[PDB]
Amino acid sequence: GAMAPSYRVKRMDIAKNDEECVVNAANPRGLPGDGVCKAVYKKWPESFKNSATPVGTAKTVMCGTYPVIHAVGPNFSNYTESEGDRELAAAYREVAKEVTRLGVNSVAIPLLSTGVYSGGKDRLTQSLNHLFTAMDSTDADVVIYCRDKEWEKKISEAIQMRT
Template identity: 35%
Template sequence: MTHKNAPDKTHAIKITVGDITTLDVDAIVNAANEALLPGGGVCGAIHHAAGPELANACRPLAPCPTGEGRITPGFNLKAKYVIHTVGPVWHGGNHGEADLLASCYRNSILLAVENNLASVAFPAISTGIFGYPEDQAAKIAVSTICELTGELAQMPQIYLCCFSPLARQHIEAACQHHAST
């Protein structure tokens, strides 16, 4: 049921389509692997753009369990920091994937708050080679961000950086759904 006077918590979310490594924000989030090593997809792109210093900074922080986060400098990125989080691999949805994915967003935002960051950009965590369905991942991202918006006294500006127009459609639909509930 919608409440006319209930605040729309999706205001903390800005949606963009493009290359996350080029965003001028305080931190970008890396959809990392547990070893925090350069990989494929967004992880590989972030490591490539940041330079070899990023891998060196990650080594002592590994391993990073699924759902947790670690923070490093951004090195050659426009972003001052990289928040590394390990998303769940999709195994059909009955193995705690939703809770683990929500933990990625929650823990990354809490790291940003702890480090007094004003803006954070997220990719669509786990939707690449980890196989999480984009529409379901978008709903979890939006609901977790909105939940934290209601809990935290100071919330950074959140950018959801979509790699494709279809990913943007999933985020927009999740925002519309969340705003109407």
């Protein structure tokens, strides 16, 4: 565990993270995909061997000894708000189980379902609160990766608000 488990946010490519493992915003079929998923495919392509997994689940594949936790959030184009919310919460609970099982002291994580799976809605708060619900009981240092300066400010504010 981390000596004083923390949350942090950084505005940069999660493929350049300084953590002991990464969470991919995966698609269910293990395809190279778009956005975060494509950056993860480019950096850790070996981790896409048998990475396909259902919506609401996480499957870890090693790249060398570096764990890639493929977490499949719902595409809010396809899911109802209600069902999508349930699956988005579930994907984060499976991420917490994987981070715990791996024994890492740190994890790089994107906000699931906030990009091409957002259904064109702003899901910063929805996605971040499900991240917190899942990860608060873990003792890993969590570093959230985002690309927008205003999302960085909002994520940083939400972290600092809880102390």
